[PDB]
Each structure stands twice: as C-alpha cells, then as structure tokens.
Design an enzyme around this catalytic site. Structure first.
Site, PDB file in Angstrom:
ATOM      1  N   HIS A 165      83.548  47.775  34.401  1.00 41.88           N
ATOM      2  CA  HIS A 165      83.622  48.391  35.713  1.00 41.88           C
ATOM      3  C   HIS A 165      85.084  48.769  35.992  1.00 41.88           C
ATOM      4  O   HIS A 165      85.983  48.071  35.550  1.00 41.88           O
ATOM      5  CB  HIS A 165      83.079  47.438  36.779  1.00 41.88           C
ATOM      6  CG  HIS A 165      82.912  48.067  38.112  1.00 41.88           C
ATOM      7  ND1 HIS A 165      83.878  48.003  39.094  1.00 41.88           N
ATOM      8  CD2 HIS A 165      81.897  48.798  38.631  1.00 41.88           C
ATOM      9  CE1 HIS A 165      83.463  48.664  40.159  1.00 41.88           C
ATOM     10  NE2 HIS A 165      82.263  49.153  39.903  1.00 41.88           N
ATOM     11  N   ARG A 166      85.301  49.868  36.701  1.00 37.18           N
ATOM     12  CA  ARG A 166      86.650  50.414  36.875  1.00 37.18           C
ATOM     13  C   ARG A 166      87.202  50.261  38.301  1.00 37.18           C
ATOM     14  O   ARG A 166      87.952  51.131  38.773  1.00 37.18           O
ATOM     15  CB  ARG A 166      86.648  51.884  36.459  1.00 37.18           C
ATOM     16  CG  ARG A 166      85.758  52.768  37.284  1.00 37.18           C
ATOM     17  CD  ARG A 166      85.871  54.210  36.825  1.00 37.18           C
ATOM     18  NE  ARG A 166      85.085  55.091  37.680  1.00 37.18           N
ATOM     19  CZ  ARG A 166      85.175  56.413  37.665  1.00 37.18           C
ATOM     20  NH1 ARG A 166      85.987  57.010  36.826  1.00 37.18           N
ATOM     21  NH2 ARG A 166      84.469  57.133  38.513  1.00 37.18           N
TER      22      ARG A 166
ATOM     23  N   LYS B 273      75.716  43.022  47.996  1.00 35.01           N
ATOM     24  CA  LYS B 273      76.584  42.391  47.004  1.00 35.01           C
ATOM     25  C   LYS B 273      76.803  40.933  47.380  1.00 35.01           C
ATOM     26  O   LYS B 273      76.594  40.035  46.560  1.00 35.01           O
ATOM     27  CB  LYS B 273      77.925  43.132  46.875  1.00 35.01           C
ATOM     28  CG  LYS B 273      78.667  43.414  48.182  1.00 35.01           C
ATOM     29  CD  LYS B 273      79.947  44.225  47.934  1.00 35.01           C
ATOM     30  CE  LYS B 273      79.656  45.664  47.536  1.00 35.01           C
ATOM     31  NZ  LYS B 273      80.844  46.333  46.924  1.00 35.01           N
TER      32      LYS B 273
ATOM     33  N   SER C  91      77.153  56.241  38.393  1.00 32.58           N
ATOM     34  CA  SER C  91      76.634  55.469  39.512  1.00 32.58           C
ATOM     35  C   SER C  91      77.066  56.107  40.828  1.00 32.58           C
ATOM     36  O   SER C  91      77.884  57.021  40.832  1.00 32.58           O
ATOM     37  CB  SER C  91      77.112  54.017  39.438  1.00 32.58           C
ATOM     38  OG  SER C  91      78.500  53.925  39.680  1.00 32.58           O
TER      39      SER C  91
ATOM     40  N   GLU D  29      80.783  44.525  41.684  1.00 28.75           N
ATOM     41  CA  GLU D  29      82.121  44.260  41.210  1.00 28.75           C
ATOM     42  C   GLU D  29      82.767  43.113  41.950  1.00 28.75           C
ATOM     43  O   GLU D  29      83.577  42.431  41.417  1.00 28.75           O
ATOM     44  CB  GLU D  29      82.996  45.480  41.319  1.00 28.75           C
ATOM     45  CG  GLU D  29      83.185  45.900  42.732  1.00 28.75           C
ATOM     46  CD  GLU D  29      82.358  47.068  43.107  1.00 28.75           C
ATOM     47  OE1 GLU D  29      81.415  47.376  42.428  1.00 28.75           O
ATOM     48  OE2 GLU D  29      82.705  47.687  44.085  1.00 28.75           O
TER      49      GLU D  29
ATOM     50  N   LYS E 229      71.985  44.633  45.614  1.00 29.03           N
ATOM     51  CA  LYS E 229      72.543  44.644  46.956  1.00 29.03           C
ATOM     52  C   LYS E 229      71.626  43.879  47.908  1.00 29.03           C
ATOM     53  O   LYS E 229      70.407  43.864  47.711  1.00 29.03           O
ATOM     54  CB  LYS E 229      72.761  46.082  47.457  1.00 29.03           C
ATOM     55  CG  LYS E 229      73.907  46.847  46.776  1.00 29.03           C
ATOM     56  CD  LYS E 229      75.234  46.059  46.689  1.00 29.03           C
ATOM     57  CE  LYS E 229      76.224  46.444  47.778  1.00 29.03           C
ATOM     58  NZ  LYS E 229      77.171  47.487  47.287  1.00 29.03           N
TER      59      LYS E 229
HETATM   60 MG   LIG Z   1      79.651  48.218  43.222  1.00 27.70          MG
END
Ligand SMILES: [Mg+2]
Ligand SMILES: [Mg+2]
EC number: 4.1.1.39
Lengths: 122, 439, 138, 439, 122
Positions: D273-274, D156, D354, D183, D154
């Site tokens: 990643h979801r 991001k 996370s 993401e 970060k």
């Molecule tokens: Mg993230």
C-alpha cells in the site's frame, strides 16, 4: 494416443505393471527365490497402499509393513508349497491382498517383494 | 633415490595410491616414481635444520613398486604409500590436498594420472559415509528386486516452477520412482528454488496418492554458500519429502560432507550428481580416474551417484560400480581395481546410469548393473509420443518385463529384443515407444 | 547447425567462454563448436513437448566465433555466449556447473579446454568478491 | 560550468535521473542543471585538500542534457548521470539518499521534481525484487486469465476483530479473491493485531472450503519497529495464510526490504500500500513522480502495489504500469517514460486499482489494465443492498462477463454498458448493484 | 433480497460465475487462445477443488494440478478439435471435471484456465 488411467490401477511395486501373473508365472518367480537361496515368506493386508497417518517426517510412511502369514518358509525346495499357502490366505481372508517376499540371509535383508493376489472388487 | 623403496612392505594403515606416470624424456621411471613420492610428501628443494627436530622417515611417502603400462614405452604405474598420520580424520578435502595437491605440476613429468587409492579401514572408519546407503534406501522406499527408475525434467531452464512440477507429476504418476532437477537448476530468475520445492512437493504427493507407491523428486540443494545449501535442505525436511540432491564436485567436498551429515541427522536421501567430472577424469594420461572420485564420494557421503551410461569400457565400469556398492573388492587389474578394498561395513552407494537411453536399452542396462542401480531417463520419458505418463509407463513396463524374464532364467544379453517384443503385445504404451526409438 | 551463429552480436550481460576444441577426426569445427554450445546449454537428444511451453532460443548457448590454432592441426578456439538468466546470482558453483558440468565428456571431441570467461558486470556485481583486497590489506 | 557536460556519453552502468527543474529568475537552465548535478553529487562550497587524494571526476554527477518543458517558459528537464560506485548494493535507502537527499533545498531553485530514474541492470541485479511477482503469484493461487478482485473492509476502525473477520468471510465467499486490512489498521485498542489475524484466518479458511477457490486476506504487518513487523509476518506464516501487507512509504524502505526478504524465505505474498504518496507525488512542480516510487518498490520488493484509480492521466498511468510489470520498457515521452528501462528478468509487480469503483467501472478497468491487475473495491462490495456476499458476486459476475466479451473480440470501450446489461438479465445480484450505482 | 447460496455452487476460477458455456460460447473462448497464439490443452479430475492434505505452509495447496489429457495441441488452428477432445474425455471419464488451459510459449507460463464440463450429479 491413449491416456494413462487415473484410477483403478494402484500399484504394488515390482512386477505390478505386468498383467497379473498366472499360476505358472508365479511359480517361476518363486523358483527364482529358491535357486537364489532366499527364503520365501507371505504377507497380507486389507489395505493395499502406502499412506501417512501417524507421522510425516522424511522417510516415515505408514503401510509399508503388512502382516506376516505364518513364518518364513526356511528350507523350502518346492515352489508349489508357497503357491499353496497363497490359496490358504485367500481362503481365510477373501478380501486381503497377498504378496510374496524373500529374505536374503547373506546380505541380511529383505530383497524381494511382489504381488500374488489382489481381491477383485477393489 | 631415497624415495624409491622397492623392498617396502605396505602397512595395513597406509593409504596407497596408484599413479600413471609419464616422465619427460631422459627421466627413468624410478626417479619419476621417487619424485611423485617425495613431491606428494616430504620432498623439498634445500635442506632445513627443523628436520632434525623430528624423524622425517615417519612421514615420507614411498614409491614401493613400478610396473610398465601395456602398449606404452614411456608410461608406468608407480605405487606410493602414505602413512596414516598424514591425514585429518573425516576429511576427503585433506586426503586430496595431501595426495594430489602438488605433484601434478612437477616439471620432470609430462603427465600424471591418479588411477586408484587403497583406503585403509582405520581411515575410512573416521567417516560417516552414505547417509543411508543401498539397503536402508530400499527399506525406506519399500522397493525391492528391480532397478529404480528416474527422469530428469527438461527443458532444464525455461519452465515456470509450476509447469516444472506439472511435468514431474505426470512422469511420477506413470510409474517412475523419481524425477530429478537438472544439475544446472539451483535457483534462477524464472524459477526460484523455494517455489520449485513447493510445486514439486505437490507433485510428489499427488502422484504417490494416485499410484499407492512411494515417490520422490531429487531437489537440488547445490548453492553458492553453505548457509544457502542448508536452507534448501531444511525446507525439504519441512515438506517431509524423501530425497535431495547435490553436485559434489562443483559444490565441493567440504560442503558435500556437511550436507551428508545433515541428511543423516534428518532422514533425507542424498542423490549425488558428478557435474564437471570429465574436466578431471576423461583423458587417459592426466587427471584422476572416476573410481578415485567415486571412492571419495562414498567416504564424504551420498546415497546415489551418477556412474555413466555404459551405452565407456564395460569392465572398468563394472569395476568401480563394485567399489561403490560392495563391502570387499579384490584387486582385479582387468577391471581397473589396482588395490584390494575393504570398506568394513560402510554402506554402499547406488550407481545411476543416465544419458540418451530408451526402452530398447533396458535389457542391457538391467544385465550390466543388476537390481541395485537407478536407470535415469531424460528424453526417453519426455519424448514419448503420448506424453510423460505413458512414457514413464513404457519404461516401467519394459523394466519389469526384463526383470521377470531374467528371474525366469532367460539370458538378457541374447533374448532382450524378444522379451521387449513380447511385452509390446499387451502394452500399447511400450509399443508406441518402440516405434519412435529404433533398435 | 542451429547452435553455430557466427553473426550473433554478444550482449553486455552474456557470459562468454573461450574453448580450445579438439574434435574427433571427421568432425567439422563448426559442428564441434555447435556441439560445445548445445551440450553446455539446451541440447537434448530427442525433442520433448515441454520445449513448446517456453522459448528455448532465450536459453541457448551460442557458438558465435570459431578460429584455427596456429601451432596445431585439428584444434580450434570456439567462443560460446551464455545468457545471464542461466546463472544463480553469487554462485561460482552454479557458474561452473552450467558451463563445464557436462561438455568435456562429449564423444565427438578428443579433448576440450576452457581458456577464458568473460564475466559481465551484471553478474560479478552479485558477488562479494575479496573480503578486503589489495588496497585495504596494505 | 564543469558539471554541465552536454557531450557526455552515458555509461551502461550509470544511474540516470530526469529532473524537472524550476530555477529562480536570473538562473539559466545550464547552471541550474549543473547545480542539480553538483549538489546531488560532489559539489561543495569551498575547496578542500583531500580532493587531491583521489580523482573527483570519477564520482561527479554530470548534467548531460537539458530540454524545455511544453507550456512553460521557466521549467526544464535536466538529465543527470551518476556513477555506479556511488551506490550501496541492494539499498533503495542509499539510492534515494544519494540522489534526492540534498538537492531539493537548493536556493537557486524555486522547485524541483524527480520524474524518472534509469536503473541499470548492474545495479538492479543486486536486489531481490518481488518476493514472487506476477507469474509466480498466479501459479500459487491457481488464478488465470482475469484481473484479481479484492475488497477493503470498512469501517477501517470501529469493529471488533470478530466482526471484522465476519465481513471478510462474507466478501470472500461471494467470489472475491481477497479482502484487505485498511492502511490504518495495524494494532489498536479495540482490535489488536493477533486477534484480527486469528479471525481473518478462520474467515479465509471457511470461505475457501465453501467455494473451492483459494482465498486470502492482506494482513497488515506495518508496525512501529522491525521486531513487531516481523512478529506479525511470523504469525501469518504459522497460520499458513498466503499474503501479508505493508505500507512501504510510512514504514520505510529499510523495513520494507527486510519484510520482502522474509516473505521470499517463507513463501508469503506481499501486498504493498502506498499511504502518504501524494505528500510527495501530487504536485507537478515539486517532489517525486510516483513512477520513481514504483520502480523503487519493485527493487525493494513487493508482489502487489497500489497504482491508482484511473477513474489521473491515462497515458502516464499506462506508462508506470508497464514499468511495474514488464521486462523491457522503451523510452516513450507521451507515457512519461523518460528512459529505456531493462529489468533483466526481475519479476513484475501486480498493479492494484482502488478508490470509489463499482460494477459500472468494470469494462473500463479491464480494458485499461488487462488481466494482470487487482481491482480493489471498498464501498462497491459493502454497499450492495443485499450485503457483502451478493456484492462480491455482483463484482465477480461483472468482471467475468467483461472478460468473456473481450475474449470473444468485443470492444470493451464501446460495448461495456451492453455487456453489463446483458449480464443483469441472468444475475439478480448484478441487477441489484446496477440500480444503486448509476452510469 | 436474495441470499448467496452456501452449497452446490463450488467454483473453478475464471468464467465459472457465468452460466455454463454453450458449445458456441466455448468455441469462442478456444478461438481466443488460438488467435493469441497460445497452445490449448485439456485437463481433467475426479476431484474439483483445492484442499490441504499433505502440507499447509504458505503457498502450498493440494488439488491445484489436475491430470493432463493427452498433450498440448501444438499448432491447433481449429477450435472444433479442442471441443471434440472434451467429448472424448467425457466418454472415457463420465464423472470427471474437464477444463481447458492455455500455454503461452512467449512469457513461458500457463496463462489460461476455464471449466468446460462439470459432471451433473456433483
Ligand atoms: Mg484504505
Ligand atoms: Mg543433466
């Protein structure tokens, strides 16, 4: 239970898992070449082992060739001649490995290789 | 009848076959032999007009000789000659289709076995043969004057790829030239092939760097499809490793020949395993003798081939080992060599002995096969009480002691136990191996 | 011995094999079947420490049924169960290598014939099968 | 009606679904359940003559069981069975199209949620599954006996690719196993993907060379098209790095499955990643529970999957974490496991926790997930007062202290604060982290 | 503000960020293996860390394997047996790293690895 050593026992292919061959024992192996009608030859090197520096494609290795000492001893009938040349190499190159190889002029290939001298200190 | 031609002079371009024929009661050898000839060639049940558009005589298989089998009153060897033009160049597949495709189901026969084939030079020259063969392999690996040594990793199934590669590194570092994938090990849920190839490569390179000697692992490329088989060989090529493996009877000859070509083009050695051979080659009265399957492999292509344990009949083994290794092999009925075989400089294949062998077998194995062989352990390394590296060292020491003794002029058949006993005095690894396995 | 398990209930995922077994004289049928099972799976001639890195019971062929053959003497049908995990998906090559690769050469057998295989759906669904098949062809 | 068959015995090849059904007032559970079954299968509004050209019964979804939901007077679980033949082999896409494609819009329902699926072995065996899975990943990375640790970089968006890679190197060198692409980070004006991949590779290799431990960065391959996604994976492959990333719900299952195959073929780990899951999986009355999306990922393929923070309901999380990791999971309603699930040796997926976690969470996280997990920070490393490398070291120390204490037999749920306090005495990095974040 | 060191603190994965484990602490970690029904085994090496010499494709590294010391200690019920073997390695290979690993015969994999001895001087 003994652990197989991980250092100090690098190898030189055939007969190198035996205790180092005495002069008597070496003579008998050279006599085997002569009786077989194979031509003895000496090779030597300051580097003992295989490596991969210049290429790494299948079946390519460096360090397979060593350097020829003089010429193959065509028509040698006396093993002591071979062992004497081993002492000559040792004299000119005290810290070189020396091996005895054998040429078969009938199947047209090299057919023998075994270590004759390893510099101690190595 | 017209297919029994006992006066026929075989042509130097004919493929010749020696069939062990067991006819039904009432069927003389001559029409049994003639039926084999016609049924494995031009024979058909009714006449047809298209026969008059060619000269059928030119494509007839002929039975040209019949002899009785020793100890049998109803078994004969029938010799059949097939013209060169019957066969597709470079195809073992077509050679078997043409010769053994149909005749084994003939009703007038109780049983039928193909014992031998004379592969003429005109035909064998249309095949690549071994990707490298015996001499090139020894030069590439820088290995001379002794049998090569290997170990098959066990359990075949059970291990993670990493645990599998661990066992390979320990075997190789102790003095074996090779380790091998079990025939069953291809790609399976708990060990996918690409993972296994990565860890075995790490192991090959660790053991080679440790010992100074060239090392390999027979990475099994056997697969469900040609595309997958080649994907596996391609990754081995990327990794720069020296040798891959194929199960040539279960994968099949079309696939094997494809793989042999890929290996020639990319400098890979090819280890051939003979899984399923005893389905075909075990029974004396029916099937095909392994020497037929061995010649076919030499033509299709492989650098090693599993050839038994010799721990069958000595003379028969010695027979087909010559057919695998030598350039010219004279007819020799005592050794199961029914035809003189000339390979016109096609390279030979290294025979591999495996199956339940340990240090005490080393003198006999060295004496039987000589230097151009692979002695393949699998139990005899992984069963050493001190583990894999000492088990490997014990086998390497036993072998080198036998080779040293043989070269000195000692008789391995008579003095082997003494040779091994003398080596135990200075090799604690060998001594330990010798008390677990006993003879 | 340990590879004859007549109380074993076959799994719906197992590959089953029916072998016609002809043992050498003096070899009991149960030993022959056990051998067919051990020699077509995990049977190794000496113990190896690596067996302790896994659970071999999971990968054992098991002979779970034996019966005599009417028309003959010294012939038995032996049933062998193989776990699904032994087999490469979509590969007939591996299926034959695994089941018939080695056992036909076993010394204690005079002769061996594989008569049938139970191919479970869980394995056959990993194969294309016929490019078209009977109905599409018509 | 005809789609409610409460006497039906499910077949071992059926796909089974558990739907939480909220019918409109006046609609009994039985025709709601039957409507779900017919609407997610063969139901159509008028009769048609082509039905007589087949046997519709063979393709009917059936509602075979209905039970009330605790605390609700107008909500039921309806169980539906679908035949194996409905589904395209290897396609999660078709499985969702067939089951959830239409029925969620049915007017007789107020709301509908898919809670669980029983994926039979016959169907799951037609999928690759994880490119590697838990065991292979630990062997490849040479990492055993503890959760893995990561940090998301970060901000991001904001950084140059170089400044981004700088932050990665500092995190990794301090003791994290991985760093990750946010993401949202794909390819954007101020940080194009190929630049980011080069600098992150420099960082991975610098930190690995410094520490002696294997390092990775989850390089995001998520893209607008399949061609771009694969171009990104291909460059990661060229760079020789160990792991890439995909957003599987926003990229989608067809793309994910393609990427999973590429990763198997090329030895890359795949971090999943979801993003967008809570659009679907948050509300108790409508959508799909994450355990459905988790099973689908395991089938399509991934080696890691984001699985929450557990800092939702403990028992439900523990439930789908088992469904993700284990080979066989027994029905267990307390843990949201509606069906017994047998994966017949398909590898498991590592769950990733996370979202707002710091050193004081380490005992609880270790206790909840055990070793086969990734603990993913993102604030808890980059928020350390001494910077990234000390923040990483603080997290690595806290974790290893918890693992040591647990292995010794200490209870992490009761003694965690003491375990952490004792480690602060010899780790100034941990002490510093512990005074900023408080509990 | 302290700076994380850039040298002299190369690592060995799990537990290597802790102070070096005392004999008492090591014994407890070995007891954890035994209680878990995992098989202890020792490995050792003269090279401590991962590297890439022979290949660099994804997931390929050198130096992951070390060398096995004897055999896995099947049926070990006494942690002190393991710690004693650590002293035997140290005796035969004074300048080798030693780690304790653990085999799970149920999930069929290696499941533990932690450093037992680092040569000082390194
Ligand atoms: Mg993230
Ligand atoms: Mg085998």
């Amino acid at each position: 239970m003994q652990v197989w050593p991980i250092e100090g026992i690098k190898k030189f292919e055939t007969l190198s898992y035996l205790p180092p061959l005495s002069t008597e024992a070496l003579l008998k192996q050279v006599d085997y070449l002569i009786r077989s009608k194979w031509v003895p030859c000496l090779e030597f090197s300051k580097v003992g082992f295989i490596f991969r520096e210049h290429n790494a494609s299948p079946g390519y290795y460096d360090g397979r060739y060593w350097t020829m000492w003089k010429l193959p001893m065509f028509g040698c009938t006396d093993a002591t001649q071979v062992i004497n040349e081993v002492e000559e190499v040792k004299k000119e190159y005290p810290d070189a490995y020396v091996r005895i190889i054998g040429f078969d002029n009938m199947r047209q290939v090299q057919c023998v290789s075994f270590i004759a001298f390893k510099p101690p200190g190595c | 009848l017209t297919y029994y031609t006992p006066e026929y002079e075989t042509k130097d371009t004919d493929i010749l076959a020696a069939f062990r024929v067991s006819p039904q009661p009432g069927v003389p050898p001559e029409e049994a032999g003639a039926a084999v000839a016609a049924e494995s060639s031009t024979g058909t049940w009714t006449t047809v007009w298209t026969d008059g558009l060619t000269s059928l005589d030119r494509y007839k298989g002929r039975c040209y000789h019949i002899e009785p089998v020793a100890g049998e009153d109803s078994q004969w060897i029938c010799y059949v000659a097939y013209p060169l033009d019957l066969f597709e160049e470079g195809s073992v597949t077509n050679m078997f289709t043409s010769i053994v495709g149909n005749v084994f189901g003939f009703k007038a026969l109780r049983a039928l076995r193909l014992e031998d084939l004379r592969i003429p030079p005109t035909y064998s020259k249309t095949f690549q043969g071994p990707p490298h063969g015996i001499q090139v392999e020894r030069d590439k690996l820088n290995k001379y004057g002794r049998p090569l040594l290997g170990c098959t990793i066990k359990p075949k199934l059970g291990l993670s790829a990493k645990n599998y590669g661990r066992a390979c590194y320990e075997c190789l570092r102790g003095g074996l030239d090779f380790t091998k994938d079990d025939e069953n090990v291809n790609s399976q849920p708990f060990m996918r092939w690409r993972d296994r190839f990565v860890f075995c490569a790490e192991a090959i390179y660790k053991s080679q760097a440790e010992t100074g000697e060239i090392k390999g692992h027979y990475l099994n490329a056997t697969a469900g499809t040609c595309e997958e088989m080649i994907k596996r060989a391609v990754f081995a090529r990327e990794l720069g490793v020296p040798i891959v493996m194929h199960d040539y009877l279960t994968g099949g000859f079309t696939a094997n020949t494809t793989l042999a070509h890929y290996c020639r083009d990319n400098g890979l050695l090819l280890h051939i395993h003979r899984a399923m051979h005893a389905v075909i080659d075990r029974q004396k009265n029916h099937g095909m003798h392994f020497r037929v399957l061995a010649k076919a492999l030499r033509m299709s292509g492989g650098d090693h081939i599993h050839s038994g344990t010799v721990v069958g009949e000595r003379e028969m083994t010695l027979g087909f080992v010559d057919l695998l290794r030598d350039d010219f092999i004279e007819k020799d009925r005592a050794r199961g060599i029914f035809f003189t075989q000339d390979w016109v400089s096609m390279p030979g294949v290294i025979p591999v002995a495996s199956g339940g062998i340990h240090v005490w077998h080393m003198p006999a194995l060295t004496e039987i096969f000589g230097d151009d062989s692979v002695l393949q352990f699998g139990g005899g390394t992984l069963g050493h009480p001190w583990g894999n590296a000492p088990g490997a060292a014990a086998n390497r020491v036993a072998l080198e002691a036998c080779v040293q003794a043989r070269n000195e002029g000692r008789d391995l058949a008579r003095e082997g136990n003494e040779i091994i006993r003398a080596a135990c005095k200075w090799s604690p690894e060998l001594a330990a191996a010798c008390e677990v396995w006993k003879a």
